[PDB]
Amino acid sequence: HHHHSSGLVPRGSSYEDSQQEMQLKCVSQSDELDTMMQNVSQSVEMVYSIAVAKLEHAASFRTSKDYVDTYTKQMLPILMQSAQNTKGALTAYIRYNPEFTEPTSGLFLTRDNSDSEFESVTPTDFSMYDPSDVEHVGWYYIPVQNGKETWMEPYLNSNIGVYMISYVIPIEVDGESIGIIGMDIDFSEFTDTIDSLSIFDSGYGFLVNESGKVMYHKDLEIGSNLADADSGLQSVVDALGNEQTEETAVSYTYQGKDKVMYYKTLENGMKFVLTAPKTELQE
Numbered sequence: 001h002h003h004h005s006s007g008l009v010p011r012g013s014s015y016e017d018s019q020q021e022m023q024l025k026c027v028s029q030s031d032e033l034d035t036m037m038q039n040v041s042q043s044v045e046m047v048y049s050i051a052v053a054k055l056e057h058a059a060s061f062r063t064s065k066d067y068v069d070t071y072t073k074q075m076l077p078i079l080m081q082s083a084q085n086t087k088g089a090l091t092a093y094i095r096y097n098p099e100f101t102e103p104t105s106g107l108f109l110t111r112d113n114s115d116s117e118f119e120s121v122t123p124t125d126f127s128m129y130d131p132s133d134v135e136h137v138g139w140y141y142i143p144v145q146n147g148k149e150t151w152m153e154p155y156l157n158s159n160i161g162v163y164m165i166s167y168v169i170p171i172e173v174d175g176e177s178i179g180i181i182g183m184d185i186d187f188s189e190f191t192d193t194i195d196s197l198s199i200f201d202s203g204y205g206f207l208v209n210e211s212g213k214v215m216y217h218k219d220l221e222i223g224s225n226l227a228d229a230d231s232g233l234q235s236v237v238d239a240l241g242n243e244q245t246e247e248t249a250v251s252y253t254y255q256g257k258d259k260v261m262y263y264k265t266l267e268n269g270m271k272f273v274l275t276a277p278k279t280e281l282q283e
């Protein structure tokens with residue numbers, strides 16, 4: 001009774017038992033994908049709590065460069081320590097509203113990989129880019145326009161050259177926007193995990209938002225909608241928008257095969273979908 005986990009699966013390895021195995025695999029793979037998302041969200045929340053406790057007189061951000069600069073210098077070791085110990089964080093930042101602060105004020109910490117150290121670098125200059133330019137300044141305008149904590153769907157950050165997701169909390173005082181605090185994750189951390197997943201003979205996973213927009217799929221273009229690949233995928237999109245169908249078997253037809261999927265909502269609001277041909281569940 002010394003059980004060992006499964007190793008390399010030989011090629012060719014009841015229907016109810018297969019449904020149960022697929023349900024558990026959906027849940028465990030979602031737990032794995034959630035790992036770095038939870039690491040980052042917990043760290044951002046912790047620094048946010050310190051940041052707002054220290055921001056004792058927000059009115060001075062509009063009229064005192066000394067206040068902004070002193071506050072920033074106090075926050076630097078806190079943000080740096082947190083980022084350095086956040087597995088999967090690629091950047092960390094505290095930036096301020098460009099209407100009343102200097103456009104490179106605040107903090108921008110970067111590193112290449114989890115084995116390297118974070119460095120404090122000049123923050124991206126708000127005065128150089130249009131507010132609609134997601135690839136340069138989206139990590140400010142999208143969360144602030146949302147008015148709450150925001151997981152950003154994947155985008156190319158052109159300041160660092162990486163396709164990433166981000167968790168950003170706007171810093172507001174009495175309803176007024178003061179700044180943001182956030183960290184980023186290289187999206188390939190998640191797509192690599194997707195690529196390594198299988199079930200049965202040819203089952204695979206993919207990532208989609210609640211409206212059916214593709215975040216990552218080995219065959220479908222990023223940013224396309226599932227319903228535009230095959231009219232049979234409207235049944236999948238319907239399930240994604242109905243919370244009561246989470247973690248239940250959903251049947252559909254795609255590219256000439258009956259398929260079964262299970263989905264689970266991830267920490268960032270994406271849906272992880274695990275799918276297989278119906279014949280692979282059959283006995």
Ligand SMILES: O=c1cc[nH]c(=O)[nH]1
Nearest residue numbers: 093108123124139159
């Ligand atoms: O200054 C910053 C902050 C977040 N993200 C960036 O690319 N730059």
